[PDB]
């Protein structure tokens, strides 16, 4: 039945789904260690650390092809989206926000949808570097990684924003699980693009967002 | 008598008041923290150090805009004004150079002329944001701050260029006297070319200069 | 006799030559220090620190002058000439190939091979600058200086991908010579280019070229 495959190719993330990407990417940069200090004693520089945990796949992928990071801070509508989650993650009144959203089935759900985000982002960098540089297979890994792990990947300099400087951890080092798993999501469909692969783009996108999801939910269910 | 606003708005930049921008800016790069023996010992770092202090606002705008920082190395003529005075504040026989505008009162013209500059270099980034970004409110206080203080941001990088890793001290973290109010201008003034401020951009401009000015006046007085 | 440097500015350098820049720079970037231990356990590192020893030049000549980095990973026969020299120099099987190519003469040659890739790099970087800035001086010494001795430069943001991080050791503090004599080079051809300099390009190419292919050749004898 690749009935329902199509049906899901319809989807759209700028209500939903992006603020889910919002909430799990600034939930987990306070849950690093010392993240909860830097809110307090610098406000600034904990904001800028999860602009850099939300929009890091758009920051990165426009250095790698010089286009304005600024651009990314034109749309007010997703800055503002992302910064007012940020900032009842961290300010709400007697922690009521964390501590809802912290709750293990809200965390499963939204952390399964910005895996869901984490597909559009890699087909957009793929996409998009198809309008820059048409079969240049080794342009639309690099810019679909880009947009899928871009926190993954600034994370050295991200936690320079916080005012930590670890330079043994290196993501090319040791690859964490979401950059690997990103790098061979911008392989497989860098290939589809490219029709090198034997699948429709709809059915790979959602056999890969499958079984992205049902990983970090074994991951999160293993953990606690 | 808003009859002198409009004749103070009239002010050309390129002869005197760079100049002052760049003699406060390199003597201020003298007297950090083993500036002295870094030009001895290595006059390239020590340049290139000072170069950051003067042009650290055209460098990181362009950085923000993917606009080619080697343009502001175009114009031989600003990059020679800058440079011989770096010269003079080091290399100058007798030290005669320095121990001349250390005097305070010379001191006070000189700092309270970069005051000046930090305006229509703020001015400057946020009309160039309107023509890259049309009412992007957040592109036009971003540019606007990173040209009125630019040298401090890119602060932790300089420090690396001269030698010195202080990953602990970041912009965000703790923000300076002078980066906070270039803030504090670019809001302000990007509220003005928006409209939402009830005054001429004539009027706001002199009333946040002399508000500058006289702080920093103030500050080096009841520092000596 | 000038009829010999006309025919040796018909040098193409796609075949023989970028292997022989790809291979010194890869063999030079192994030698350093701890490189084996990253290489066995950690691949992806190793083999984008060799990409920033081979296209170093490239990569900040294209970050100074705002064009995009991934333009470089464009050309997938420059990128993989490069990758295929990588894995050769560091698993191939007995380590035959290094071996091979420590051999003395044949360092010597593939070295001195090197330094005339690093002529062409200057001159190409210089015209490159004049295309987008006509008689800016000090921009065609820049980029002629950044495609010359690019992984000299990035050597501080190369160190750290591997994961050292020396912050005292710049490349403005203590110039090496190969930074140090592209500097000269990029000088010398900028004087040529804007005819302040009384030679033609095609003599003070050769002259330069040997001049620099006598110096590393000299080096590398007085060194073992």
């Given amino acids: 039945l690749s009935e329902v495959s199509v049906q899901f190719s319809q989807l759209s993330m700028f209500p939903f789904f992006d603020m889910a990407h919002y ?33 890091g796949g758009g920051i990165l992928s426009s250095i790698l092809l010089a286009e304005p990071p600024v651009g990314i ?6 800055i503002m989206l992302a910064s007012a989650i ?25 952390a399964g949808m910005k895996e869901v ?18 079969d240049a297979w080794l342009v639309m890994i690099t810019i679909g990684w880009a947009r899928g ?22 993501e090319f080092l ?16 860098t290939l589809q693009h490219g029709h090198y692969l034997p699948i429709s783009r709809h059915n790979l996108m959602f056999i890969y967002t499958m ?7 074994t991951m999160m269910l293993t953990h606690s």
Wanted: aromatic residues 16%; positive net charge; glycine residues 6%.
């Fill in 23 to 55: 909430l799990a990417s600034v939930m987990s940069a306070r849950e690093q260690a010392g993240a909860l200090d830097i809110a307090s004693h610098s406000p600034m520089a904990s904001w800028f650390s999860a602009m850099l945990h939300c929009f």
């Fill in 86 to 110: 940020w900032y009842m993650v961290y300010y709400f009144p007697y922690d009521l926000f964390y501590n809802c959203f912290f709750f293990l089935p809200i965390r499963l759900i939204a």
């Fill in 174 to 189: 040791k690859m964490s699980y979401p950059v690997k798993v990103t790098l061979i999501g911008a392989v497989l469909f």
């Fill in 73 to 78: 801070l034109a749309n007010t509508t997703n």
């Fill in 211 to 217: 079984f992205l999801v049902s990983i970090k939910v």
């Fill in 117 to 134: 985000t984490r597909t559009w982002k890699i087909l957009s960098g793929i996409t998009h570097a198809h309008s820059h540089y048409k």
């Fill in 149 to 170: 792990a871009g926190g993954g990947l600034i994370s050295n300099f991200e936690q320079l924003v916080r005012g930590v400087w670890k330079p043994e951890s290196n």
